[PDB]
Symmetry: C3
């Protein structure tokens, strides 16, 4: 049944998603899932040997290619990473269920670990375009929640200290920040960015927190990595050019992809 | 007509609601109404003589028991209190009309006083779990409103000085606070809690302000009382276990039940 | 097709609107457009010669009178100002598309400059009721966006410095401030007002920013002018009576329409 239909149980569709993915991939269960956001598009190429590719629109609940990858750890053991193909934003109007469907499907496949990445604007002048920042916490400014009902979930540690420790083994220099989510799709005015800051955020973007609350609700351990696309409006006196931003964004691709693939082995 | 349809006038449903109530109870008009939040389930047991109980889902506009209670005052005269059953939340996804329908039903019965109570997280460390707090003002962070048109209504004193005066005669030690309504149902993150602080809140919860605005627009005097369920996330260095919370919550039962009962007689 | 039909292209409907206007008015294109807000009702009477009046409920996508005005310039040339009739608020529940249809219809007629006016409450005590204020930036607190897709648009200078400079050649005494948009229609509680102050706003109201973001997306140069209806709740020690507000409101009429006429010539 259609995820859009309020009578529909969202987890029942995630269930059917998971069961399709297992049949189409020959992988009974996965161990971790990655949501590659703006800028990480090739961040999974060094994850490992692709085991299966599933036309994403073919999976229950969805509507480009979801990948199943054998991650090989140093001791030789293997994990199975589910790389979600698409991504649906809150701004698309498709409902919060559609925004978090990837996450709940990740869950149903048994992937206890979730890696959420995104592109965003930075409020700390110390982190320029290209800088990856670990999420230490978040501020959901969407006035939305992906949970329906008396689902009183606790968010005291949405972003697992365990996982950031493992990220800091791969690169002890990665800074940490509080990520704030705006509904988007438009960008923030300088007065809005000052606001984000006053409220305590170090980063601003238009995704991830709904996904994160959803995942914690499913009992997942969540790693959150932002790739600062460029300083937020009004932060730097000398704003980068749009071409400069896109340029600083491509430059990061190899580093960023090296990062994920390494963290994923642990 | 069903409240869910934009065509329906929510007030006409309220009217049907109050007419059902006067018929079923034999009480032609109530004088005051009480909404019992989390932790107040038994706060109306010393209120007075229960004259009638109406299964809530039987009153037009709803869908668990609504009560008419006689309040015997000092001077020997009576007052009838309507104790609204349910309490539909914004997060239930049934619409803002469903949220404030009880308040409009109460207004329709002729109540001129509304007491709203709720359970919330506290940000003042002085107010441990079990602490009742009068609302001196609120901050509605739901980006939603109960009013549907160029209905420009004044909120300069949503929480009546008169009623807080009376409550202080009953118990001059009730502190007062500014309450913030988040849409929920998830709880706030340590960063969002600090944020509520930064914005000027002393308390965070998932209800009440929509109801209060609805009420003032209907001309009622509002008294808001919160019951700190437990310090908000990240507030206390030392979290209280669930046993401590549920425990501090039950110990407060006798006090708030006596509080309302006294307040109702005035 | 109807605008609230998600499959409908909001821009096709703007186009259809621009075409109706062109034939109904005889003017092939407009150069600028004005949105008359609360208190600006007669602010376009001195603009110039009314070349045509089109009942609004008659232009595609709408549902009082939309005006086509010839503006005579210093060098003798002329410009055409499309003065939008109506004005649909976010609160009416019609959808964000109907809120910014006016703007999109203006752009489609070829207008390049847009003057957004509104009445609002003020947080600065030096700007009492009747004071016109220019917007230097805004804070959109509605959790909504007029944009429906990966439409990533830069909002670093929503309110054109160019125009604000012209605004100041006309009247060098106009102060500037940051505008906060609440979804409304209920007004703000004293704490919500302090909140807006802490967040960086000098003015609070129920419109403008979604339109502005919409204009900026269409490539329009935006000039935003508020008229302080009166001080925000809890700001002034001695609040004005509603009689004093409406009065201060009308006494500003001639200055306000002189202002727009002079600005319209440039
Ligand atoms: N809101 C918001 N979203 C973003 N997404 C990206 I990539 N960069 C930004 C940014 O600066 N602000
Ligand atoms: N938002 C919110 N609602 C609550 N309800 C209760 I009981 N405790 C809380 C809390 O800490 N936050
Ligand atoms: N939100 C808001 N809108 C307004 N519109 C006008 I006229 N005055 C106000 C005000 O004080 N607050
Ligand atoms: Ca597993």
């Amino acid at each position: 049944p259609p995820l859009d239909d309020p009578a529909t149980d969202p987890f029942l569709v995630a269930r059917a998603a998971a069961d399709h993915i297992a049949q189409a991939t020959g992988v009974e269960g996965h161990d971790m899932a990655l949501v590659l956001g703006s800028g990480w598009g090739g961040a999974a190429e060094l994850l490992g040997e692709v085991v299966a590719e599933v036309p994403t629109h073919e999976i229950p609940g969805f509507s480009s290619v979801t990948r199943s990858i054998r991650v090989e750890r140093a001791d030789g053991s293997v994990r199975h990473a589910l790389v979600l193909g698409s991504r649906t934003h809150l701004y698309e109007g498709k409902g919060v269920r559609a925004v978090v469907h990837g996450v709940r499907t990740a869950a149903a496949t048994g992937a206890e670990t979730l890696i959420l990445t995104n592109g965003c604007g930075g409020l700390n002048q110390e982190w320029g375009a290209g800088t990856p920042v670990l999420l230490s916490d978040h501020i959901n400014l969407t006035a939305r929640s992906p949970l329906e009902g008396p689902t009183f979930v606790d968010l005291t540690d949405v972003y697992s200290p365990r996982l950031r420790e493992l990220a800091h083994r791969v690169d002890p220099t990665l800074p940490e920040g509080v990520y704030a989510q705006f509904p988007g799709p438009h960008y923030e005015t300088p007065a809005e960015v000052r606001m984000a800051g006053i409220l305590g955020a170090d980063l601003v973007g238009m995704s991830t927190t709904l996904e994160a609350i959803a995942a914690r609700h499913c009992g997942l351990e969540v790693l959150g990595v932002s790739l600062v696309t460029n300083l937020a409006a009004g932060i730097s006196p000398t704003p980068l050019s749009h071409a400069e931003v896109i340029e600083a964004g491509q430059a990061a691709g190899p580093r960023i992809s090296a990062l994920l693939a390494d963290i994923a082995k642990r």
